[PDB]
Structure formats: C-alpha cells, structure tokens
Structure 1
C-alpha cells in the first residue's frame, strides 16, 4: 500500500513509509528463539573495508530458520508476523506442536493461524518446505538451498522468488530472481511461495537522514576528490573523467566482468 505524507515539510513531500498492516499485534519480538546481540561495526580487524558504513539505529538479530529439515513432518501454527530490522522481508513467528518456536521468513499470503510444515510429505501450499524434487515443475518457490543441507541462500529478499523450470537427473533447473538459469540439486529444500512485502521497492526514503537511520554513510564521488584519492580526482573546474570510468582502486566500472572464469560452479549455470 505504502504510507504517503503531505508536504507539511520539504522532504516530507516525497517521503514514504511501508504499510505495517501485516504486522500482527506483536511489534516487540520474541526472546528465547532470538534475539542475539548484533555486532555493529563498519570494518574488519582494524581498517574499513566497505566504505560509508555506520551510524543508524541499534538492532537486535532475529536468528531465523534457514534449514527447515530439522522438523521434517512436524507441523507448526503460524502465530504472528513481525518487523525484522535486519532484512527487507518480514518474518513469521511460528509455534510447532513440538512446543519449539522458530521464525520463518514470511512469504506473501501467509495468514496467522495457518498450518505450515516441512518434508517430502507436505501439501504444496504457501509456507511449506520440500526438497526441490517433489515440488511440481513451474511452481514458484523461495528460500532455496544451493547445495543440500547447507541452508536457504536464494530468494529471501522482499518480493523475490524463483520458478522451477524443469529437471535433469538429480538436478532441477531454477530461474533465480536475477533471471539466471541454475541447476540446483534435487535434494535442496525450498519453501513454496514468493517472499512478500513486495511494496518494499516502492518506498521513497525522502531525505538524507533516513539514509543515515539505516546506517548508510554519505558516498562521495571520485570526481569530488583528488588524484591521490581517486582516478577521477582533479583536475580543474569539473572534468569529464579522461579515462575509462574506474573504481578508486583502478579497475573499470562500466562493463568489466568480474566473476572468475574457471569457477567449478560454471557447469551448473545456464544464464545471465
């Protein structure tokens, strides 16, 4: 839906906030299962190695369930859907009959009170997790494992999915959010449905501060700098570059393919 504001201030005239109506009466989270201390820090042991990180709201990590094959066969009741500061998506709090409480990343269409479960069994319904094999060709799916028993790694961003395209002996072909065509092992779990919160892309930050709230420090142009700092630094009053556009570290930034050629992963990929 997206919340919109009137221009009672500049920067409030474009600003735009998510709709939280799917956030069920459960705004503060769940101890026990999560949260952990989350360790803010824009850099490695010592030095900054990703520029322009820092500031922005304190967070608690929700330790979510990315391998659903523990509770094969054990169903769970979806108890709530809550805000997760550390991902684009929303998260489902679910209660297993087992007693155990996990969070699943919350797919589009998930309703509270719903039944959900994981395993070879598993009715093909939104919320359920299955090894890729038993899932019908053509169904859209998410939180897909890359290699079996290694955890969900594909399609967890808000409003993303992959579609099952066909099969090939032990592998089923996937079409990933990027549009790539991937052979992913049959035995990999993946949960049916799309991610949801799909209006995430429609949000307009609206002002500088908002950027900072999310811990995004001001990014400065190479043009703004000096020859010591950047290939684009200097010279006089503005300058068009004077070389093929580059990163600060000298590599070209328009076109230069960067995936290494001889990756053994290659023989499992069929697209862009």
Structure 2
C-alpha cells in the first residue's frame, strides 16, 4: 500500500513511500521519451515569475496523447504500467493491434494487459475513449477536454473522477473533482474510470531532502523579510501582521475572490466550487 520505515534515523520514521509493486519495470519507449530541462521559475527574461523552483533530479517527458481520436475505431492492448516522474498519476503503455505504440494515462484498477477500445462505438469499460454523450448518466470518468480534439485537461491528478450528471442539450453537465458543475460539449471525449495512484495523496514526505528531490526550493514567510523586501516584514519580535494578510504584491490573501469577473466561461458553470 505504502512502504514505511523503522525509526533507525530521526527522519526515517514518518517517512513513507509509494507502492510500485505493480509497476511493469521498463525504461520508457525511446521514440516517446523527450527531454525536459528545468526552469528555475525564471522565464525568457530571466526573472523568477513562478517563485521557489530549484533542481531535484533529472526528468524526461513521455508524450501522452490525450485526444485518443487519432486512433479511435480500433483497439490496443495494455502492455505495461511504468512510472512517470512528471505526473501525479501512473501511466500505461498502449500496443495498438495495428503496429503503432502510444502512451496513455493509467486509471484505477486497469490490470496489465486488458485490451481496451476507443471510439463512440466503445464499451463503458475502464480505459475506453468515449464521447461524453454516449456515457451513462452518473458514470465515473476522467481526462475531459474543453472541446473536441483539443486535449484532455480535466481529471488528471491522482484518483480523480469527473462525474456525468447527465445530458441536456449538446452540452453535458459534469461533476468536476473540485466540487463544480460544468457544461461540456457532448462531442467532447472521455476515458472511463477514476485516475488511480490514489494512494498518492497520503505519502508522508518525511525530510527536507524529499522536498528537494521533487525540486521545490524552501518556501519563505514574508514575516522573515524586511520592509524593503516584502509587506509583512519588519517588527521587533515574532510579530503579528498589523495589516490584513496580503501577498508580496499586497493583493490580499485569505478570502479574496480573484477570478476575472466578466468571462466566456461564466455561461458553462452552473454552480461554484464551494
């Protein structure tokens, strides 16, 4: 489920580790293994836009086509469930009966070797490419596009499930994992099931290092900084605030709606993530 550790070192107690005992051990396919360099958070101007990014371990991209519509109407069989360091989830290896291999995202349960399909003409099985309209009411799914062909941008993190509330017009209502209700153009695609990994959410990190190894340079209380540096700075003691909680940029954190008030999305969200 998760490996644990006897307390032989101080930090080797709470520490916890994944269960990769179901990972088809394999060096990911060569003609699918692009090269990701890291970006300190600096952009093409060399200034840290994102903030607090740094190093960790060398990583590579595995192309994971999300629009299965490039090969729907035929099926492939699962070949392996290797380990991507860039995703919160696990990924799986597709052997299309007609030669071409691909990589797709791996869902919850889907045992190594199950032969899965793609096309509107597909059984609600785990791992099928299926349009959202042909999906049963109340069914469990992930990997949802905001338009046909675009690419699956919904339900991708570990153990996530967008849930078909049901059809309507040509826009199917949907339950986002955040707790939101979204209209989706029924010619949008889907992949049946929960994401899996699932266990992820729970692995205790355990020590500084473990943060570093995923490349998350140490985070910083502005309450450390000085006036010159950032808002909450100054003081003579472990000091409070003296103003309302606020980002470095002074635009309040803690209870301040930040979404842009006018938008085109505003007539596709029937409810709010509350």
Q: Secondary structure at the match of 1:266?
A: helix
**CA offset digits 1:28-61 (Å, max 9, x no partner):** 21111x1111121122011111111011001011
In structure 1, C-alpha distance between the alignment counterparts of 2:79 and 2:66, rounded to whole Å: 18
Distance in 2 between residues matched to 1:171 and 1:21, nearest whole Å:
41
User: What is the CA–CA distance in structure 2 between the aligned matches of 1:24 and 1:171, rounded to whole Å?
Assistant: 39
1:200 match: 200
Give the match's secondary structure for 1:4.
coil
Counterpart secondary structure, 2:200? helix
User: 1:225 corresponds to which residue?
Assistant: 225
| Distance (whole Å) between structure 2 residues aligned to residue 25 and residue 225 of structure 1 | 46
Structure 1 CA distance for aligned equivalents of residues 231 and 168 of structure 2: 48
Match in the other structure for 1:151: 151
RMSD of equivalent CA atoms? 0.8
Where do 5+ consecutive residues of structure 1 fail to align? none
TM-score, normalising length: structure 2: 0.97
CA drift of 1:172 comes to: 0.6
The within-5 A match list for 1:1-272 is: 1-26=1-26, 28-32=27-31, 34-42=32-40, 43-45=42-44, 46-271=46-271, 272=273
- 1:79 and 1:108 map into 2 onto residues whose CA distance is 16
1:174-208 alpha-carbon deviations (Å, 9 max, x no partner): 00010100001100001000000001011000000
SS at 1:109 equivalent: coil
Q: Please state whether the residue corresponding to 2:153 is helix, strand or coil.
A: strand
Kept after mapping to 1: 8 A contact 2:38/2:55: no
Q: SS of the residue aligned with 2:64? A: coil
Count of residue pairs the alignment pairs up: 270
- In 1: Cα distance, 2:83 partner to 2:125 partner: 23
SS of 1:154 mapped into structure 2: coil
Q: Secondary structure at the match of 1:236?
A: coil
Secondary structure at the aligned position of 1:198 is classed as: coil
Cα distance in structure 1, aligned partners of 2:166 and 2:160: 19
Shift of 1:62: 0.6
Alpha-carbon distance between aligned partners in 1 of 2:126 and 2:35, rounded to the nearest angstrom: 31
- Which 10-residue stretch deviates more, 34-43 or 132-141? 34-43
Give, in whole Å, the separation in 2 of the partners of 1:10 and 1:65. 43
Distance 2:95 2:191 in 1: 17
